[PDB]
Every structure is written in structure tokens, then in C-alpha cells.
Design an enzyme around this catalytic site. Structure first.
Site, PDB file in Angstrom:
ATOM      1  N   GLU A  44       0.802  -1.244   0.000  1.00  0.00           N
ATOM      2  CA  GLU A  44       0.000   0.000   0.000  1.00  0.00           C
ATOM      3  C   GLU A  44       0.831   1.289   0.000  1.00  0.00           C
ATOM      4  O   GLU A  44       0.675   2.156   0.870  1.00  0.00           O
ATOM      5  CB  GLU A  44      -1.001  -0.003   1.159  1.00  0.00           C
ATOM      6  CG  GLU A  44      -2.045  -1.090   1.048  1.00  0.00           C
ATOM      7  CD  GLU A  44      -2.879  -1.240   2.295  1.00  0.00           C
ATOM      8  OE1 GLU A  44      -2.314  -1.172   3.421  1.00  0.00           O
ATOM      9  OE2 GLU A  44      -4.110  -1.434   2.145  1.00  0.00           O
TER      10      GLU A  44
ATOM     11  N   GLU B 152      -3.942 -10.891   0.026  1.00  0.00           N
ATOM     12  CA  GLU B 152      -4.771 -10.825   1.226  1.00  0.00           C
ATOM     13  C   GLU B 152      -6.210 -11.133   0.862  1.00  0.00           C
ATOM     14  O   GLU B 152      -6.743 -10.559  -0.082  1.00  0.00           O
ATOM     15  CB  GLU B 152      -4.692  -9.437   1.861  1.00  0.00           C
ATOM     16  CG  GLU B 152      -3.292  -9.006   2.235  1.00  0.00           C
ATOM     17  CD  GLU B 152      -3.222  -7.591   2.738  1.00  0.00           C
ATOM     18  OE1 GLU B 152      -4.206  -7.132   3.338  1.00  0.00           O
ATOM     19  OE2 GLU B 152      -2.174  -6.937   2.551  1.00  0.00           O
TER      20      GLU B 152
HETATM   21  O1  LIG Z   1      -6.785  -5.246   8.427  1.00  0.00           O
HETATM   22  C1  LIG Z   1      -6.785  -4.353   7.345  1.00  0.00           C
HETATM   23  C2  LIG Z   1      -5.716  -4.759   6.333  1.00  0.00           C
HETATM   24  O2  LIG Z   1      -6.053  -4.212   5.065  1.00  0.00           O
HETATM   25  C3  LIG Z   1      -5.161  -4.421   3.980  1.00  0.00           C
HETATM   26  O3  LIG Z   1      -5.607  -3.588   2.933  1.00  0.00           O
HETATM   27  C4  LIG Z   1      -3.713  -4.065   4.349  1.00  0.00           C
HETATM   28  O4  LIG Z   1      -2.792  -4.408   3.323  1.00  0.00           O
HETATM   29  C5  LIG Z   1      -3.345  -4.723   5.686  1.00  0.00           C
HETATM   30  O5  LIG Z   1      -2.006  -4.472   6.073  1.00  0.00           O
HETATM   31  C6  LIG Z   1      -4.336  -4.270   6.758  1.00  0.00           C
HETATM   32  O6  LIG Z   1      -4.347  -2.858   6.884  1.00  0.00           O
HETATM   33 MG   LIG Z   2      -2.592  -0.432   5.246  1.00  0.00          MG
END
Ligand SMILES: OC[C@H]1O[C@@H](O)[C@H](O)[C@@H](O)[C@H]1O
Ligand SMILES: [Mg+2]
Ligand SMILES: [Mn+2]
Ligand SMILES: [Mn+2]
Ligand code: NA
Ligand code: NA
Ligand code: NA
Ligand code: NA
Ligand code: NA
Lengths: 1024, 129
Positions: A481, A550
């Protein structure tokens, strides 16, 4: 800006006098630990800190001590402040590249002893494994250097500054700097020397500086391989190098915490089983390439390693220095648009893992990392993403030995630049195919900022060069990000230049202009599917694959619909799986005053608990494991959906498909659980299947022998035949028994032998039902049928908002008429209740008919609910009855899914069986929310002390139930805040809303939503 | 101890023994500011701190007296509005206190209620949860 020091506000000042990054190797003979107690003092800002060029040990000696390594926000009594949790928002104002002027500065000091001979014998260095945020280093009152990069290591040459006898090390550590802007991970803000410090003593005249090991297959058929070894020796006083490669130890090797952590060498004879030797000649290149005959492949499923010893040899023929390590024969390619290891297109069964410990934070003892990884292997995981920074260098050998596909990620997140934009434009949602345009607008601040190029390149250089020899790492990642810009392209070029052998990942680069892989986070199926089609040409060819770096956000009760993601993974070659966010809740242990108790309890802190100016609350509590790093129902479900063998039972047959990438099913023992006798299953290769005719209902696939960190008898996979709902053969007493029926002004009474039924006509409430020594009654607040649950983390952003808006928690039952008649077909009495069930302030509700048919030993309850009125809610959390259980209540037993909780979109890991409440450890959520429901329940038996059982079952369809004594869950911030009644209740539900992953990701899928509609269901309450 | 309101050696019997919470009590404001808000025959005192539990205070072998307020300048204050207040609270933790009497017009504090000049010996525990 002279009140803030130059080096803290200069993005190009990445380090001063730091030695170039080299491949990490721990050596007991070279590494001397400087961990332990150090003199320490904290200052408001740099200008209050002492000039280290004048700081004596006599002066520093008098300070308090802190123990290295540790964070200074995690000390006894919070002596040096408290942790701060932010997700996106920076905890400082944005004025790139300036840090705040008020900038916590910790100064560390200790001494070490040096010999007369030591300075003659050795080149002396200091190595710091990680310091947050940055620091300057002094030896003996002299400035050595400066460093940035919180999760990267650093070495400094100390030879010039060193003296015989007492030596003084002083480290000035700063909390904020220009670096803070690129270290904005969704995690705790913590500071200090939080990783090992070491004194290195390298042989002076000549020593091994760097090593480079690659294994490349010579062939299209992945057999013979070229092992390349390139050594950089520093100094002239050496003759040549020796290399010894040993016979492999099969990936099925047994390990434990003890053997994985064993650091002994020197006099320990590394190995004996020599496979290959090689020697360099005097005055020749200290590198070589050798052809290796059909070596054993390294794989995450079978991490076979060849140990090696590399010896630097002097003119006299003695061993100046040794490196003892391992080779993993494996090759990663982008091949026909797939990530390929050894020719094979693999599947990631992955998880994101932060460095976290509930007491030590990011200062995680290796012991504890081993705990994490063993647990992962025990739950079918095969891949780890280092979100979002490199770990302690010693961790990567664990990956090598245990077998994980690893994405090693640069320490670089820039997320905070988005927050003001998000707020200024009132941005509600981001989507994986569309969201990069929102990051594009702010990229110029950092990722597209030429002032930051040196820093971005440094994070890349440091990431790759330290960990380049670990076969488990197959992908380098440019961070997380950080938008997309020129600096990312620069990082990409540098990495391919430094390490051509691996692939590059970066999710912020939507179109993979400078990445080798496509990557989404939390996408819907529709979004995955569009992307596939737009990147699959007419031929069916794609150029790059998609992973989910993710997905299935594991916050609280959830995630839902891992099943549907997995179906997609197996179906398309284009999808190569993904990594769950996240491995574990980031809770910090602290003392909370209980809302229930007025007393002090141990609890796990998230944002707000340490009273931060700005924080992001519960968003740190989003793991498959809890803060204490133990499995939640999320992990239990994940293990099932990702099981590497499919077992299907239908039509007198068991079909078994091998869903591994490399290994066969040969190591597995298949048991027919109905007989206990093993099923003879042929050896199945990846993707092969067999149908075996059998009468079985339940088959388990289990480990034959101890292998890796798993024990003989460990369950890898299982399957069941679907279980029809059988009506229990309870015998209803229909004999003619006289019954005393009293239809009073307000209360209606039905008394018979062994039976007493009282209903409050005004409320629709069972005042008391006592049959054969067993008592229940309505748990009543407003209505006899209730709809509310304590909102999950996933419920919070939308569903909860809707339910609250429509006043679902304030549903009232308004009685219109009660009809009372004498029994007919064996029944004693029929009591019919006519009412409207509707919340205050609203039109919508159910025209309801509750018909109680009363027998001597049974009560049949027929519920008709007809949805009426304008302005209806879309869905409900649940629908059902709540009963108080009598004082006699002792335990329960049920036929259905277990042993743990289950929900419509999170249930398949809980197999069918007969379960006893006594055999089960009830799971406690770190953040109190909806829990303990059992779905697809065939029947429920509730045991009363010395009065037998009450059997409950629903006609034609399985039901949902919870039995607890808990309340005040909604308002409870921590486990200790949960209130408890003096008696138990049964929550008896016809239906329940799914769980989903909407805290971050898709809503509860349509077929799992409890949609607003008419309800019709019949229950029997059968008394023994 | 005695409550819900204030109590003094010769003006205490209307305040029965019980467990009392400061939150349940409307503190009495005197029209003419003077000594107020003492609690006599206190068995133990719990002082609650936000998110840190309680401090329990008790005196060995004998009940004690206490006042908790933020007020000062009561001597010079002619009216309720003249009373000054600190930015934090204090505990007045007393071994003994003079009686109250009716001497503005009538008999002095009776002998057994007078805090007579003498040696003092007392032990307190400050117990932290
Ligand atoms: O738990 C929310 C998550 O959302 C994703 O977008 C991010 O890459 C993670 O590091 C964390 O912020
Ligand atoms: Mg983040
Ligand atoms: Mn709490
Ligand atoms: Mn006045
Ligand atoms: Na952050
Ligand atoms: Na696939
Ligand atoms: Na998070
Ligand atoms: Na809650
Ligand atoms: Na006065």
C-alpha cells in the site's frame, strides 16, 4: 528547520558508514551477543539528549537500565510510554520529509571487554538486527555512523575506534524521522533496539564476506541441475576455498523447537555423508559451477535439504573460516503465465504473518516463531507472506527446514498519504480493480517522489541481499500500500539485477508494469472473474497469474465463505490461491477494569486501550489465531477448506483425490471410521483420484509416522457421507389422562400428572413449564421470539447499522388473543396464541400464531410468522426462542456439527457426530461478539441433575442452538467485561444470519443471508 | 462506615452503618461555609481510579475519620459562591476530630467529645488493588 536535526529530515540520508548488505549466516564463533541490560535514558527531543562525543561510561553508568532487545513502550509499569495503534492515519502531521520537532529520543549505553590479542586477531564489527526508527552509533566517544530501516539489519566497522580493555557503545535512537512516512504498516507504533545486537569478530587478514548459492535445472525435464557457488573473500592472505556437499536428508525429517533452534557448531562435526567435493586453485576465481546428478527437489510439501560446508583455506593449509549451511534444489519461473516451482504450477495455501508477541511486541523470541510455524503446518498451511517487512534473519532457516512458500517483503508502506484524501472526498469503499486511481492522485508525495528514490532502492537492496540464499523465498515483494510510482519501477529493476532467480510482487501495481504477478486483496468473485477474462486471450493463454495476497479477513467471528474462494482456486489455472489476513490478533496484555465486576483483570489491548490521540480500535484484532497465538474457529475452518486431499462419500463409494502439488498420498493412512479398520488406498499422484466401493459414512486421512513437526496420527483430511435428518423414536404419551385446565383472567394453567404448564396471556410468556422434575421458562424481554445477536466485527460496518436502524433489538410481542381448548388426539390441551411481533416505532412485523399442543411427556410448539407492513429490514441476525433452564441444569449433548461453533458460511470443518458439552473447550473471543452457535443440529439433549433429559428437535429441518449464561456482550470491550447470569439459557433458533467478512471484504453471500420473509417451524420438547 | 451524609463525634447516630458510594449521595452545601463532609467511625475507605482499580485504606484497631473534596478558602468564604476549588481532589485522612457542640449559643462540646491535647499513636494501611 534547524530545531530538527538534518539527518532526521533527509530521505537520502539512508545511512552513514553502513557496510554493504550481505547474505546472513549465523556463526557461534564470530557472533558475540551484546544483549542484556543497557544504561538507558529517554528525552523529549534530540536537543535534550547528551552530546555522545562527551558521554563517559562513568556518567551513563548512573542511568536506569533497560533490557536489549525490547521496545520501550513495553516496559514494567509503562515507564517509557504506551503503544500507539494506527491503521492508515499517520500518528504525526504530514509535512514531508519533516518529523515532529517533539521526537522521543532514547540513548542506550553499555560496555564490552577487548583483549590485547583480539584486536590483533580480528576485524571487529557491530551488527544490529533491527532498531525503530533510526539511530546514530558511537564507540568510545567517537561517531561511527547512522542508519535507517527499522526491520532491516545493519553492520558497522568498529576496528578504528576500538581499544584494549573497556569499550563504550552508545546508541542514540529516534522515534520519528523522514523514514516514518514509509513505515506506516497497520500495526502498533513501537520503538527501540527491539532485535539482537552483536559484536562480530572476523579473521583479520582474510575472511568470507559474502556467498551466493543458486540451483538451476539444465533441462526441460527438471532432473540434472547446476549448483553455482560464488564467494566474495575479503583480504589477500588465503590460498583457496573448499566446498563439501552432503547426502540429502528427506523433507520428512523430524524436527522440534529444540533441534530447530540448536545453534551449536565449531567442534560439532557438521555431516559425514559426502556427496560432492570441490577445491579452488591458488590465485583463481573464488567461485564455481558444478553439474549435479538428478538431485532431490526442495518443495514446501517436502523440504529436502543438502547440507554443505564451505572452507576458506590458508597457505599453510589450515581452515581460516567455515560456513555451514544448506542447499535447496528448486527453481521458480513464470512459465505459461503461471508461478512455477520445478515445472509445476503451485497453489498458495497461505497466511500473512506479522511479528507479534502479546508481551514483547515485535521483539519476538525465536522460540515463539517456531510455535507459530509448527501451528501453521498443523493446520495445512504451506505459504507465508512477511507482511509487511523482513523478519529476524534467523527465521528464514525455519522456512527452509519446515517447508513454506515465502513472500519476503520490503519494509515500505506509504498508506497514510491517502487518509486526508479519503476524508476530504468522503470515500466509503475501495475495490481491487478500481482503487489504484485513488492512490495515483497522492503518489507524488513519496512513491513518485525523486527525493525518496535512494530510500526505496535501499529497502529493496536490503531486502534481497540479506535473504537471497533461502530456497523457501520464491517471491520478493516491493512493500504494501505505497501507491504506484517511478520509485517502484526503480526497485523492480534493481531486484531483477541483484537476484534474477525469483519473481517480484507488488499489489499497488495493478497492471504489473513493474511486477511479474497479478495480486488482489479482498476481491469479490465477480471482480476476480472479470480480471481473469480480460487477461485471458482468445487462445486461452494468459501472460501472468493472479494471487490474493490478502483475502478472507479473519477478524472475529469469521471469515465466512472460504469455501467459495477455494472452489474458484481449484477451478481455474489462472488463480494460484492466496494468503489470509492475518495470522494472529495483535493484542497486547494489560490490566483492564471490568465492566461486569469493578475489578482488575488480565486482558488484550487494542486501539483506545492505551488512550491514543488517534487510533483505529479493534482493527488490530484480525487474526486466525488470538493475541496469545492460539487457534480460533477461523483457523479450524481454514484447515478444512485448504485440506490437500479431497474425500467424497456417495453412492456406496469413497472418491479420494490428491490435491497436493508434489507429494503422493503414500505417507497417509486412510481409516474407515465406522469400523476403525484401514482402507487400502493406492498411491495417488498430484491430481489423481480413485473410487473405492464401501459402506462407510466417515473416512479420515491421517499421518502414518512422525514427519516434519507433525506426529503420527495427525489428521490431514477427512470426509463424510451426508447425514439424513432422522426423527428420534421418542414415544409420546397419548393415553387418556385427566388434566386440570384453568383459563384465568391473565394466566392459563395446565396441570396433569408430572406436568405443570403456566402461560401469561398478557405477554405470550411461559411463566413455568415443569415436566417430570425438569423446568424451563421463557427468557423474556419484550418478545417470546427474538431476533438479536451481539454484533460480530463483520456485522459492525453495515448489517449492524441496518438492524439497529430497523430496531430489531426492540422487537415486541403484542398479544391479541389466546385460545384454550381440551386435548383431542391424545393431547391434554391445546393453547393457541395470536399476536403481532413488531418493534417499536415501526409498521413492519409478523402476524404470529403460536400453537402449544401439550402432552403428558411432550410439548409440540408450532410457530407461524407472517411478515407484514411497509418499510421492512433486508435481513435479520436470527429468529428463535429463548428459554431459562431450571436450577437442575447440568450439561448438554447434541447430534449435529461439532465439537465447536458453526455458522451457515463457516460450518464445514465441524463434522457431524454426537457431541457432549463436557468434552469441549468453549472458545473465548478476544473481542466479545456473537459466538457458540451450533448449526445443522439434528437433536439436542439437555441433562438435568437426577431428572433425566429434555430432548429437542425441529420438524423436517435441522436447527440452530446456543447454551450459555452470558450477557452484556454487545457493550463488553474485553473477555473480562462479559456479564454472567446465575442460571443458563437456551437460545433455540430456526435460522441464523451468516458471518461473512465485511469488516474488510465481501458481505455475507446471498445464500447465507437470513432474508426477511415468512417463517414456519415446529419444535418438539420431549421430556424423558 | 456511617452515612450517607456527614458525621461527627457528637452528631453521628442518625448516620447508620453501611457500605456507601459517593455517587449515591448529594453532598450538603452550608449557607455559611464551614467545616463539613467528615465521615466518622469509618471502617474502611475505597478510592476508585479510572481504569486502575481501587486504593483501600483502613486504620488498625480503631475506626477513622475522612473527608474527600476539592474545596479550600472556606475560612474566609462568606457565602457558598465564595468557596475556592482546586483542579484535583484531596483526601483528609484523620485519626481524630473535635466534636461540634452548640457553643454559638449554648453548651460547649461535651468533655467526651473534645479532642483533648495528648499523645497520638495510629497505624494506617494503604492497600493498592
Ligand atoms: O486489516 C486491514 C488490512 O487491510 C489491507 O488492505 C492491508 O494491506 C493490511 O495491512 C491491513 O491494513
Ligand atoms: Mg494499510
Ligand atoms: Mn474492558
Ligand atoms: Mn460572598
Ligand atoms: Na500505521
Ligand atoms: Na488453480
Ligand atoms: Na488490521
Ligand atoms: Na462487544
Ligand atoms: Na467561612
Amino acid at each position: 528547520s534547524c530545531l530538527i536535526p538534518e539527518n532526521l529530515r533527509n530521505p537520502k540520508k539512508v545511512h552513514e558508514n553502513r557496510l554493504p548488505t550481505r547474505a546472513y549466516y549465523y556463526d557461534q564463533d564470530i557472533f558475540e551477543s551484546l544483549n542484556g541490560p543497557w544504561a538507558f535514558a529517554l528525552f523529549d527531543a534530540p536537543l535534550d539528549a547528551p552530546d555522545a562525543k562527551n558521554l563517559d561510561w562513568e556518567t551513563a553508568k548512573k542511568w536506569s537500565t533497560i533490557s536489549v532487545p525490547s521496545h520501550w513502550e513495553l516496559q514494567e509499569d509503562w515507564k517509557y510510554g504506551k503503544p500507539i495503534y494506527t491503521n492508515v492515519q499517520y500518528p504525526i502531521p504530514i509535512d514531508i520529509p519533516n518529523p515532529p520537532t517533539v521526537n522521543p529520543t532514547g540513548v542506550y549505553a553499555r560496555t564490552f571487554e577487548l583483549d590485547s590479542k583480539s584486536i590483533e586477531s580480528f576485524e571487529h564489527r557491530l551488527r544490529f538486527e533491527g532498531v525503530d526508527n533510526c539511530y546514530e552509533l558511537y564507540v568510545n566517544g567517537q561517531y561511527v555512523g547512522f542508519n535507517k530501516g527499522s526491520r532491516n539489519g545493519a553492520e558497522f566497522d568498529i576496528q578504528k575506534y576500538v581499544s584494549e580493555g573497556e569499550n563504550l557503545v552508545v546508541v542514540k535512537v529516534f522515534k520519528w524521522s523522514d523514514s516514518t512516512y514509509i513505515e506506516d504498516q497497520d500495526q502498533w507504533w513501537l520503538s527501540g533496539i527491539y532485535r539482537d545486537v552483536s559484536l562480530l569478530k572476523l579473521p583479520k587478514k582474510a575472511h568470507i564476506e559474502d556467498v551466493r548459492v543458486t540451483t538451476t535445472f539444465v533441462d526441460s525435464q527438471y532432473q540434472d541441475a547446476e549448483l553455482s557457488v560464488k564467494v566474495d573473500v575479503q583480504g589477500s592472505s588465503y590460498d583457496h576455498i573448499n566446498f563439501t556437499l552432503y547426502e540429502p536428508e528427506d523433507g520428512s525429517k523430524v524436527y522440534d523447537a529444540s533441534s530447530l533452534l540448536n545453534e551449536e557448531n565449531g567442534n560439532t562435526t557438521f555431516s559425514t555423508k559426502e556427496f560432492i567435493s570441490f577445491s579452488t586453485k591458488k590465485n583463481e576465481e573464488t567461485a564455481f559451477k558444478i553439474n549435479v546428478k538428478a538431485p532431490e527437489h526442495w518443495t514446501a510439501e517436502n523440504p529436502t535439504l543438502y547440507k554443505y560446508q564451505l572452507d576458506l583455506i590458508g597457505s599453510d593449509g589450515s581452515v581460516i573460516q567455515s560456513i555451514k549451511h544448506h542447499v535447496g534444489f528448486r527453481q521458480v519461473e513464470l512459465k505459461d503465465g503461471n508461478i512455477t516451482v520445478n515445472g509445476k504450477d503451485i497453489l498458495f495455501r497461505g497466511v500473512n504473518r506479522h511479528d507479534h508477541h502479546p508481551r514483547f511486541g515485535r521483539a519476538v523470541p525465536l522460540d515463539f516463531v517456531v510455535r507459530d510455524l509448527i501451528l501453521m503446518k498443523k493446520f495445512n498451511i504451506n505459504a507465508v507472506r512477511n507482511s509487511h517487512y523482513p523478519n529476524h534473519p534467523k527465521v528464514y532457516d525455519l522456512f527452509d527446514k519446515l517447508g513454506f512458500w515465502v513472500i519476503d517483503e520490503a519494509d515500505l508502506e506509504t498508506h497514510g498519504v491517502q487518509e486526508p484524501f479519503n476524508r476530504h472526498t468522503n470515500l466509503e469503499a475501495e475495490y481491487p480493480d478500481t482503487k489504484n486511481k485513488l492512490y495515483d492522485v497522492n503518489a507524488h508525495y513519496l512513491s513518485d517522489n525523486p527525493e525518496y528514490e535512494v530510500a526505496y532502492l535501499d529497502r529493496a537492496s536490503q531486502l534481497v541481499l540479506r535473504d537471497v540464499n533461502h530456497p523457501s523465498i520464491i517471491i520478493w515483494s516491493l512493500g504494501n500500500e505505497a501507491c504506484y510510482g517511478r520509485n517502484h519501477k526503480a526497485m523492480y529493476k534493481l531486484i531483477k539485477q541483484l537476484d534474477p532467480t525469483r519473481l517480484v510482487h507488488y499489489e499497488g501495481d495493478l497492471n504489473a508494469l513493474s511486477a511479474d504477478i497479478f495480486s488482489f486483496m479482498y476481491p469479490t468473485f465477480e471482480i476476480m472473474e472479470r480480471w481473469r477474462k480480460n487477461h485471458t486471450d482468445e487462445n486461452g493463454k494468459f501472460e501472468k497469474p493472479l494471487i490474493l495476497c490478502e483475502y478472507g479477513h479473519a477478524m472475529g467471528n469469521g471469515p465466512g465463505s472460504l469455501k467459495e474462494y477455494q472452489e474458484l482456486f481449484y477451478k481455474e489455472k489462472f488463480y494460484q490461491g492466496g494468503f489470509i489476513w492475518e495470522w494472529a490478533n495483535h493484542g497486547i496484555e494489560f490490566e483492564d477494569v471490568s465492566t461486569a465486576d469493578g475489578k482488575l483483570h488480565k486482558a488484550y489491548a487494542y486501539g483506545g486501550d492505551f488512550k491514543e490521540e488517534v487510533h483505529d480500535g479493534v482493527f488490530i484484532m484480525d487474526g486466525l489465531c488470538n493475541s496469545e497465538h492460539n487457534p480460533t474457529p477461523g483457523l479450524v475452518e481454514y484447515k478444512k477448506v485448504i485440506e490437500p486431499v479431497h474425500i467424497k462419500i456417495a453412492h456406496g463409494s469413497v472418491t479420494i483425490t490428491n490435491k497436493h502439488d508434489f507429494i503422493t498420498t503414500d505417507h497417509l493412512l486412510f481409516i474407515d471410521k465406522d469400523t476403525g479398520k484401514t482402507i487400502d488406498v493406492p498411491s495417488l499422484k498430484p491430481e489423481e483420484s480413485v473410487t473405492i466401493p464401501s459402506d462407510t459414512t466417515y473416512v479420515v486421512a491421517v499421518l502414518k509416522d512422525d514427519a516434519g513437526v507433525l506426529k503420527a496420527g495427525h489428521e490431514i483430511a477427512w470426509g463424510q457421507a451426508e447425514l439424513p435428518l432422522k426423527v428420534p423414536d421418542f414415544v409420546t404419551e397419548t393415553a387418556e389422562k385427566a388434566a386440570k385446565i384453568n383459563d384465568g383472567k391473565r394466566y392459563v394453567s395446565v396441570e396433569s400428572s408430572g406436568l405443570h404448564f403456566i402461560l401469561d396471556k398478557l405477554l405470550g410468556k411461559i411463566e413455568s413449564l415443569k415436566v417430570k422434575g425438569k423446568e424451563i421458562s421463557s427468557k423474556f424481554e419484550g418478545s417470546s421470539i427474538t431476533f438479536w445477536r451481539p454484533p460480530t466485527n463483520n456485522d459492525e460496518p453495515r448489517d449492524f447499522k441496518n438492524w439497529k436502524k430497523y430496531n430489531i433489538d426492540l422487537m415486541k410481542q403484542n398479544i391479541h388473543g389466546v385460545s384454550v381448548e381440551k386435548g383431542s388426539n391424545g393431547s391434554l390441551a391445546v393453547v393457541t396464541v395470536n399476536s403481532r411481533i413488531s418493534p417499536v416505532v415501526f409498521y413492519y412485523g409478523f402476524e404470529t400464531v403460536q400453537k402449544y399442543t401439550i402432552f403428558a411427556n411432550k410439548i409440540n410448539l408450532n410457530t407461524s410468522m407472517k411478515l407484514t407492513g411497509e418499510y421492512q429490514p433486508p435481513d435479520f441476525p436470527r429468529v428463535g426462542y429463548e428459554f431459562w433452564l431450571g436450577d437442575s441444569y447440568e450439561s448438554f449433548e447434541w447430534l449435529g456439527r461439532g465439537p465447536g461453533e458453526s455458522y451457515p458460511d463457516k460450518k464445514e470443518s465441524q463434522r457431524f457426530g454426537l457431541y457432549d458439552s463436557k468434552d469441549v473447550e468453549e472458545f473465548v473471543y478476544d473481542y466479545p461478539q456473537e459466538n457458540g452457535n451450533h448449526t445443522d443440529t439434528h437433536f439436542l439433549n439437555i441433562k438435568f441433575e437426577g431428572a433425566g433429559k429434555l430432548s429437542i428437535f425441529q420438524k423436517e429441518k435441522p436447527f440452530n442452538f446456543k447454551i450459555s449464561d452470558e450477557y452484556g456482550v454487545d457493550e463488553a470491550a474485553h473477555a473480562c467485561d462479559v456479564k454472567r447470569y446465575g442460571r443458563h439459557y437456551l437460545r433455540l433458533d430456526h435460522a441464523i444470519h451468516g458471518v461473512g467478512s465485511e469488516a474488510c471484504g465481501p458481505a455475507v453471500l446471498d445464500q447465507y443471508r437470513l432474508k426477511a420473509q415468512d417463517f414456519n417451524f415446529e419444535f418438539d420438547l420431549a421430556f424423558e
